[PDB]
Amino acid sequence: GLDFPEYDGVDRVINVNAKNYKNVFKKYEVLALLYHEPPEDDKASQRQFEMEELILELAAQVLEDKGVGFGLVDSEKDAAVAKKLGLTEVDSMYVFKGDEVIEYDGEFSADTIVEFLLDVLEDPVELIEGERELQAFENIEDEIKLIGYFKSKDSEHYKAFEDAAEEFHPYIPFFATFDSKVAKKLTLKLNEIDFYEAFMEEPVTIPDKPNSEEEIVNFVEEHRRSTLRKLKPESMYETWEDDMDGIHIVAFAEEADPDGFEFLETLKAVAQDNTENPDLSIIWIDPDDFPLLVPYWEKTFDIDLSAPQIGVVNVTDADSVWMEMDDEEDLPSAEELEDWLEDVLEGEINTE
Template sequence: RFKSDHPGSRSCWAMKILVHLVPADKGLEFPQYDGKDRVLDINDKNYKKALKKYSMLCLFYHEPIPDSKELQKQHHMTELVLELAAQVMEEKDIGFGMVDSQKDAKVAKKLGLEEEGSVYVFKANRVIEFDGLLSANTLVEFLLDLLEEPVELIGNALELRAFDRMEEEIRLIGYFKSEDSEHYEAFKEAAEQFQPYIKFFATFEKSVAKELTLKLNEVDFYEPFMVEPVTIPGKPHSEEELVEFITEHRRPTLRKLRAEDMFETWEDDIEGIHIVAFAEEEDPDGYEFLEILKEVARDNTHLPELSIIWIDPDDFPLLIPYWEKTFKVDLYRPQIGVINVTDADSVWMEMEDEEDLPSAQELEDWIEDVLSGKVNTEDDDDDDDDDDDDDDDDDDDDDDDDDDDDDDDDDDDDDDDDDEDDSDDEDDDE
C-alpha cells in the first residue's frame, strides 16, 4: 500500500532529514542537530502547561516503541526529524512533543489524537493535522505557513500577476470594502479553517476587483489548473456558507501530489482507486503530456467522479524505484494509469507509438473507459488468474505424461517377466 506497507511510509520518510555534509561558507550553513533535547515527552502532567507555554504546539502521535531493532531505528530517526525542526523553530515560540498511543492514551483522548504516525499542530483553538512527508524541511515549511496571516492581500497589478501564476493551488479571492467589513471578517474566519492547505486572498482595491470582474463582497473559487474561476453564489457569505462550499468542491479535477499533504491526497480516493499521471514538468515530453492533461481536465471538469493526481517524479526521487517496481512502468516517460489503493494493482494506458504522446481525444477516450469501468484493475487480476490456470493445466499435462510413462514401464517389466518365465520352462524341458 502507498501509505504504510512500503518504503514510502511515514516512518521511512523520517530518514529524509537535513544533514550538513561538507563545510559551508557563511550564509549557507545548513543546520545540524546540536544534541540538545527539545522535544517533550507529553503526558497527563505536562500537556496543559505545554499548550499554555507555546503559541503553537506540534505533537507527534506514535504507536508504542517496538521491540524490533529496525523499527526502533525508524522511531529514533523520527525523533531526530522533530528535534531538528524544534531546533530550527526555537525562536518562533513553537513547541514540539511526542505522545505514546498506549502509555499516554488518556492524554491522546483529551487532545483528540486519533491516527498513529500523524503530527497534530495546536494553534489557538484549532487543531491542524499535518498529513504530509515527515521530513524536517517539509514540516518546518508547513509550520512557517501556519505562522502567516490566513488571508493575503492583493493591492496592485504585480501582486495580481503573482496570484494568476499559482495555478497548482486551490485558491479563493474576495473583494471587500475594508478590513473592518463584517463580510471580510467571515472570509478570514473561513480561511483559518483551511490554513495552510488552501490559499485565501482578498482585495480592497477597485482596480484589482475590476481586473478580476469581482463585485463587492463577491468571492471567486479557483480550482487547480482551471482558467476560469467559479463565483460562489449568494453573496454576501457567512463563514459557514464558505466552509460548506469549499468542503463540497475541495476535490479538484486535476491536482498535484505535494509533500505537505501527500497522504491526505492519497487517502482521498474515489471508490478505492486513483487515476494517476506521472510526468516530469522539466522534461519536454513530460511538459507536453501535462499540457494535454490540463486540456482534458478543463474540458471535463463538470464530471464529479473525475479526479486525476499528477505526480512529478522529480519531487519524490526516493520513491521512483519503488513506483517503477510496484507499477511496472518506466517513469522516464509520461504515464497515466488506474491504481487500486488497497493492493496497489494497476493498469496503464498503452501508447501505440512510444515516440508519440496520446492526443487529447485519445486520452479523453481512455478516461471515459476508466469511468465506465471498461478499464479497471480487476481485469489485471483476471489475467493473472488465467496465467495461473495455464500453469496448472501444464502441470496436469506433465502429470499425465508421467503416468503414461509409468504405465509403459510397467508393461515393459511385465513382458520381461514373461520372457524370463518362458526361458525357465525351456530349461526344465531340456
C-alpha cells in the same frame, strides 16, 4: 564555507504529561504533538523508533527560534492528556496554532515537516493590491484559490472570510482585496467571492453573497477535489485518501522537462474538457518532487519515470494498469487520454 543543518544531539522534544501540557501550550505559537504508540520491546523496534525521532528533533532544532515547539504524547502513559486534546489517531502528528488543530497528512521527513510548519506560521489571508500583484495572482494555478472583495479588514464579511480561511489553513490559500480597481478587473462585486479550481482560469462565484462563514465553508468542502490536482509532499496522504472508492487516476510528469510539460498541458486540456464531469479526478505527481520514491514507483508500476506516464491504480485489488506510449512517437492527445481512461474504467483486457 557554509554547510547545512544537522541534528546537534540536544533533545528538544518535550515529554508531555498531565502536569506540563497546559504550560507547553501557552509557551509556543505553534505546537506539534507526536501521538504515537510505544515501540515494540525488541531492539529492532527500539532502533527504528529512535532513528525516526531524528526527524522531529531536527525540525525542532531548526524551528526553535520561530516559536514552534514539539512534544511527544504516549498513547498509554499519557492516555488522559490524549483524550482531553482530541488525539485519536495513533502514530500521527497534530499541529496546534491558536484555535486551530491540524492533523498532519504529509510526508514524514524533516524538510517537508519544516516547510509545513512555516506554512502554518504564515497568516491565513493574503491581500492583493494593484494590477502587478493581480497579474501575478492570475499566473498561480497549481492550487485551489479563493479571492474576495471587501470594504476593509473591519468588514464583518471580511472577518467571516478570514474565519473560513483559518479553517482550511494552510491547505487552501485565501486572498482578499480592498481595492476597487482589482475587484473591477476580477469582475468581483463588493462582498463577492470567487473560487478558482486548480488549473482552471475561469472562477466560479460563491452564490448568495454576502457570504457567511458557513456558506464559504460548505462551498469549499463541496468543491475541494479539483478535476486535476498536484500531489504535494506536505499534504500527499490527505490528497491520496479522500477518494471514495480506492481507485485513482495517476499521471507522472516532470514539469521541468519539455515532454513532462507537454503532458501537463494535455492533462489540463483533459480537465477543461470535463468541467461538468464531477467524477473525473486525476492526481499529477511530479517525480522531481519525490526523488526518494521514484525507484519504488518504477518497480511497483513497471514504468520508466524519465517519461510521462498515466495509469489507473486500484488500491483495493492492489493492482494497476499503465498507458503504453511509444518513445518514437509524440504523446497522446487529450482525446486519446480520455478514450484510454474510459476504456480502462469501463473494464477490459484478455490476451493470448
